[PDB]
């Protein structure tokens with residue numbers, strides 16, 4: 001039993017809800033919140049920009065130190081950093097950004113990072129400003145993640161379409 005409330009069960013372990021991931025994280029304070037990161041951990045917009053804003057830019061400061069030490073992430077890769085005031089940890093995961101010409105097959109590799117954590121609050125990878133088909137992102141999530149994932153979808157119109165089109 002966990003404190004995630006109001007989710008629709010798509011599968012044994014995949015759940016979905018229309019919610020602002022920032023407001024969800026602030027309410028639940030999950031062990032792991034997933035960020036829709038880029039390889040430079042530059043959290044300028046989308047989910048990443050909103051999560052970083054909610055930390056008063058502390059996420060960006062920590063991320064800049066991480067990059068200075070370790071260099072960029074790989075597309076499909078991840079790193080674990082602090083969750084600041086939002087969660088215990090933030091799993092920064094880089095899905096392919098279609099608007100940069102990155103291979104959509106890497107979306108499965110990106111979701112595989114979730115399997116290293118028993119429970120996560122997450123957005124749909126490569127959706128939104130990363131330019132992939134969100135119905136596809138949900139399909140890959142359900143077919144790749146085996147741990148318990150609570151998916152937050154900000155756009156209500158999109159949420160209804162994902163549910164009604166889910167197989």
Ligand SMILES: OC[C@H](CC1OCCO1)Nc1ncnc2[nH]ccc12
Nearest residue numbers: 021046047050123124127128154155
């Ligand atoms: O796949 C990422 C989704 C994309 C979907 O389509 C257009 C907007 O929402 N973005 C978000 N999902 C959850 N919380 C969020 N906070 C800020 C952005 C955001």
Ligand SMILES: [Cl-]
Nearest residue numbers: 046047128129
């Ligand atoms: Cl987005």
